[PDB]
């Protein structure tokens, strides 16, 4: 009985979905159910990126699995430099301003080696050259130490084919490529597994094979990176139970519920809905829309993507905004709001945490309106727990939203909120006159009036802040555990 959360990889900076997959793993750990993260892409850094969040036992990477490197950890470091000098009698030439070396057999140039670290304990790649200095092969090293993939080059350093090795050096997978729109596209895959050879045309067919090899009767799969995982499960049998998790809005236009096409990333799942046992969304509002859109052809269930768990409310009057600096969030309006408010409340300040394209434009409107000591673009911040202790109110002025971990955390710190009434997320975390207020989309005047009203009524802000503590508590770890356990119990018995 194993529960597989299938995303794609883990980066250095975790995306929303990667965060959601890890958080679901942690809950399943506590609850006591077997869970692992399944990753699909080839990433010879995955073990480093993962180390700060999960254990080697906690995930199976597809390429690690067929390279017999699942659960493996770091080798003892290996002095490549002395191997090449003392054992091989090669001549090494450090490149300045880098962690690189050219490697020579006397006058002959052999190899170009990139080390990751400046202590040269993490060999990253090594390029090989023929007698005409043509670069013929690239050797790509896993951070754990072994040579993970060799890549054969043609023409202008174009990728022709790749070989993937277990740590002892045996070839376990082959891949062949042809270029399309300037980029290599897979045209074949060979896999050496079970003392046999297996053949495929693309990486969706290999994933489907991967999935089948993990499946024992009783297992449960979760499609979390549906642009990739949904085409894969669509090529595996219906006897293998799988739940589609959506992690954003399901349609290109939220304003045409009945008719808007589904988002591109969810098309293949929605076109083969009977493959999946259920869909999981993060809000009750989105559960209701998807249920109606699919005509209840399968269960839809809302389970939040995050949970709630320092001094708070230590109250100048601090407004806050935790939002990427992007068009959707319409952060200028928050500047406009402050423009009007400072004349009535001049001890006011508005801290906007996040980053993005729209920073320059936002800095300008600050200068234009003389608010430089009232509106601060504070950038991205690794933890905001100190920033929340003295926040009077938070503001959301976006035109489209999703369930916000940030909003959930801010409500755990007693910070009430005023938000436009847009989908999705606001309505999930914000009961009007309980922990904040919901405003009609783009009503900058009702926004002003409601923001003004709470400032002029601290005792209201107390109620709202107490309501935010009450709101947060409904998203407890144990609340999420209970939903998840129930959902898994119910899904598996219907699939009996």
């Amino acid at each position: 009985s194993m529960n597989y959360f299938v995303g794609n990889s883990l980066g250095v900076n975790l995306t929303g979905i990667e965060k959601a997959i890890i958080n679901r793993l942690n809950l399943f750990k506590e609850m006591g159910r077997p869970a692992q993260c399944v990753f699909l892409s080839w990433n010879r850094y995955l073990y480093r990126n993962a180390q700060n969040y999960i254990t080697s036992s906690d995930y199976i990477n597809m390429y690690d699995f067929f390279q017999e490197a699942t659960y493996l950890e770091r080798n003892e470091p290996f002095d490549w430099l002395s191997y090449w000098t003392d054992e091989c009698h090669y001549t090494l030439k450090h490149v300045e301003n880098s962690h690189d070396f050219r490697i020579y057999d006397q006058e002959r140039f052999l190899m170009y080696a990139h080390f990751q670290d400046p202590k040269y304990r993490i060999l990253d790649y090594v390029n090989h050259f023929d007698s005409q200095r043509r670069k013929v092969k690239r050797d790509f090293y896993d951070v754990r130490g072994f040579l993970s993939c060799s890549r054969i080059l043609v023409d202008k350093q174009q990728t022709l084919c790749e070989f993937f090795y277990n740590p002892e050096g045996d070839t376990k997978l082959e891949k062949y490529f042809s270029y399309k729109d300037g980029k290599p596209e897979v045209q074949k895959i060979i896999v050496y597994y079970a003392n046999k050879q297996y053949f495929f045309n693309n990486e969706t067919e290999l994933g489907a094979f991967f999935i089948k090899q993990l499946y024992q009767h009783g297992d449960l799969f979760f499609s979390d990176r549906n642009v990739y995982t949904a085409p894969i499960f669509n090529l595996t049998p219906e006897s293998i139970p799988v739940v589609a998790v959506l992690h954003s809005t399901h349609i290109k236009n939220i304003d045409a519920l009945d008719s808007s096409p589904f988002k591109n990333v969810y098309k293949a799942m929605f076109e083969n809905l009977s493959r999946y046992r259920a869909i999981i969304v993060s809000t009750e509002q989105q559960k209701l829309d998807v249920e109606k859109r699919i005509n209840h052809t399968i269960p839809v269930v809302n389970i939040p993507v995050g949970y709630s768990e320092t001094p708070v409310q230590t109250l100048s009057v601090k407004l806050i905004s935790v939002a990427r600096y992007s068009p959707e969030k319409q952060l200028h309006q928050q500047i406009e709001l402050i423009k009007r408010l400072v004349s009535y409340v001049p001890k006011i300040e508005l801290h906007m945490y996040g980053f993005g394209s729209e920073s320059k434009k936002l800095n300008e409107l600050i200068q234009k309106y003389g608010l430089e000591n009232h509106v601060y673009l504070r950038g991205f911040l690794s933890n905001l727990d100190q920033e929340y202790s003295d926040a009077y109110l938070s503001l959301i002025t976006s035109n489209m939203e999703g369930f916000s971990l940030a909003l959930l955390e801010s409500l755990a710190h007693g910070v009430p909120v005023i938000s436009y009434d847009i989908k999705y997320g606001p309505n999930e975390l914000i009961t009007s006159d309980f922990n904040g207020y919901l405003i009609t989309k783009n009503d900058e005047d009702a926004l002003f009036d409601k923001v003004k009203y709470v400032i002029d009524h601290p005792e209201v802000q107390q109620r709202l802040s107490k309501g935010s503590l009450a709101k947060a508590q409904q998203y407890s770890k144990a609340s999420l555990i209970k939903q998840w356990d129930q959902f898994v119990r119910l899904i598996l018995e219907h699939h009996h």
């Binding site: 880098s98 140039f109 390029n127 670069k135």
Partner: peptide, 4 residues
């Protein structure tokens, strides 16, 4: 040209 020798690095990537």
């Amino acid at each position: 040209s020798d690095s990537d």
